Amino acid sequence: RPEWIWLALGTALMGLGTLYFLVKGMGVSDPDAKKFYAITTLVPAIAFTMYLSMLLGYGLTMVPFGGEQNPIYWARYADWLFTTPLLLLDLALLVDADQGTILALVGADGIMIGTGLVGALTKVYSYRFVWWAISTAAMLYILYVLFFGFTSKAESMRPEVASTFKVLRNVTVVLWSAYPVVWLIGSEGAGIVPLNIETLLFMVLDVSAKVG
Template structure:
C-alpha cells in the first residue's frame, strides 16, 4: 500500500510532467519540416508517457509487492514501463537532431531496452545476490548506451555546424549525468543496500525523471531554428554539411 507522502510526490510529478507535455505540444503546433515536427512530437510524447505513469502510481496503480527474504519489497513497476518507452524516445530524439543513420539509432535503442529489462529483473529478483548480479548486467548495458551517445552519435554531431554541436553537447551531458544517477540511486535505495528510505527514494527518482525528460525537452527545443533550416535546405545551416 503506497502511503500518502509517496503518493503526494507522485501527484506532483504527474502535474509537472503534464505541464511539460502541454508546453512542448503547444510549442510544436507551428513546427516546419518533417525533422522539426519529429523532434517536437518526441519531445512532447516523452513527458506525456511519464504523466500517465506518475498518475497511475499516485492513484495506487502500477505498484506490486515482491517477496524477498525477510519480508516484501514494494516495486513501482509503472516507472519501469515508463522508462521502457521514454528512454528509447530520448535516444531517437538525439538521432533526429544530428541526422544519424538508422543502424546507429537502432543499436542505441536496443542497448537501452536491454538495460531497462535487466533493471526490471534486478528489481523483481527475490534473492539479493541475484538483484546485484542483474544490476551489474544492466549497468554494463548502460555503459554501452553511453558509447552510442558520446561516441557514435557524438561523431555525427561533430560533422555539423556550431549551433547543432553546442545543443547536442548540452543534451549529451544531461543524459550522461542524469542517467548515471538512476543505477546509483537504485543501489542505495530499497532494492539495493537500503540506505535511502522509500519516500526519499521516490523523491530522488522523480527529480531525475523531471530533469531527464522535461529538462531534456526544454534544451532540445533550443535547436528548433537549426532543425527548421535543415528541413528547408537539406543541410545544417551553420556548416553546410548534409544531414540526410
C-alpha cells in the first residue's frame, strides 16, 4: 500500500490505535503510574509523536542525497530506540534501577540496537554489517536471555507464559526475522533502487515497531 500505510496507518490509524493506549490503557487516571503496559503514552506517545514529527519527518528516503547519511525513514533514532526499544521488552521501561533488567537489556538497546542503527552505516565498510549483525551474533545469546527467559520470569509471580512471551518472542523470531533482512532489500542502503523494496515493503513491518 504505502503511501497511506506509511502516512495513513501510523498517524491516522495506529493513531486511533494511539487515540490511545491510553484512551484506556490503565492510567488510573493518567499513566506515569505504572511501569506496565508500556509506556502508556510514552512508547505509544514516542510512536505517534514521531510517526508524526518524524513522520514528515520520515517521508520515504532523502537525507543521503541532501547531506547527512540516512536519518529520516530509518529514523531510526525515533523508530528503533523509541518505540520499540523504549518497549521491545523493555528496553527503557525496564531499565529498572534494580540491576537485573538494567544494562543486560540496555545491553540490547544503546549497546546492541544503538549499535544496530549505528550499525546500518558506515555505508561501505564495516559499519553496515556485523555491528547490527554482531547484534545478531548476540540476538541469540541475548535472545536466549529472553528465550532462556521468559521460560524464566524468576522475577514476578506469574507464568506470563505462552500468554505474552510466546506471543512477543515469536513476533520477534518472525517479524525480526523480518526486522534484520528486508532492510538489505529495504535499503541496505545503496541510493536507492525502485524505490519500493526500499520502504514500501519494509513499512508493512514499521507497523510492528509501533505496536504488535
